[PDB]
Amino acid sequence: LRVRIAVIGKLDGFIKEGIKHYEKFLRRFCKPEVLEIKRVHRGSIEEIVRKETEDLTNRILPGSFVMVMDKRGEEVSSEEFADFLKDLEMKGKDITILIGGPYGLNEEIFAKAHRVFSLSKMTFTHGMTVLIVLEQIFRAFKIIHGE
């Protein structure tokens, strides 16, 4: 079961340390991968967002369940998230999670998604989004597996 998180933007030091921390605990349940995508596009905000969105969509694992994180998406509790994960673990379906940069995402991405989730009414940075999602995945695998 592979779990890829593709994220636009350079991750801070503490964010990379947190990734390593959650990866160590997640390895008993899945194979996690965090891909950092270089915020190097120029032009109008619309063109920057369009190119960043293409960059994320080009990192979707083929045949995976795609979760786009966006505050416009549906809110979900940890219990609900665990149900989603239990279902995907039952199906042996890999998961790609996509996180945009500071200007947001282009619409072409929503048509490639199986679910669009909002983690809060609050705005989180790209790095904090990665940490929250890895911790929720860990939490969800613990709930499902008794622990």
Output the six-digit token pair for 122: 């609050």
* Given resolution (angstroms): 1.7
Residue 100 assigned ligand-binding role: yes
Cα–Cα distances in angstroms (integers) from residue 61 to residues 4, 11, 35, 145, in the given order? 8, 21, 12, 25
Residue 119 assigned ligand-binding role: yes
Which string of DSSP letters, residue by residue, matches 23-69?
HHHHTTT-EEEEEEE-----S-HHHHHHHHHHHHHTTPPTTPEEEEE
> Residue 78's closest CA among 31, 40, 133?
133
Residue 127 assigned ligand-binding role: no
Output the six-digit token pair for 2: 């592979």
Tell me the β-bridge partners of 4: 33, 96
Whole-angstrom distance, CA of residue 84 vs CA of residue 22: 20
The number of CA neighbours under 13 Å toward the Cβ of 95 is 25
What was the experiment behind these coordinates? Answer: X-ray
Cα–Cα distances in angstroms (integers) from residue 23 to residues 27, 102, 133, in the given order? 6, 25, 12
Residue 122 assigned ligand-binding role: yes
* Collapsed DSSP state (helix, strand, coil) of residue 6: strand
Whole-angstrom distance, CA of residue 55 vs CA of residue 51: 6
* Structural domains of the chain ordered from first start: 1-147 (3.40.1280.10)
Residue 120 assigned ligand-binding role: yes
| Sheet containing 2-8, strands listed edge to edge, beginning at the edge strand earlier in sequence | 31-37, 2-8, 95-99, 65-75, 115-118
Enter the DSSP assignment of 10. Answer: P
Whole-angstrom distance, CA of residue 122 vs CA of residue 138: 22
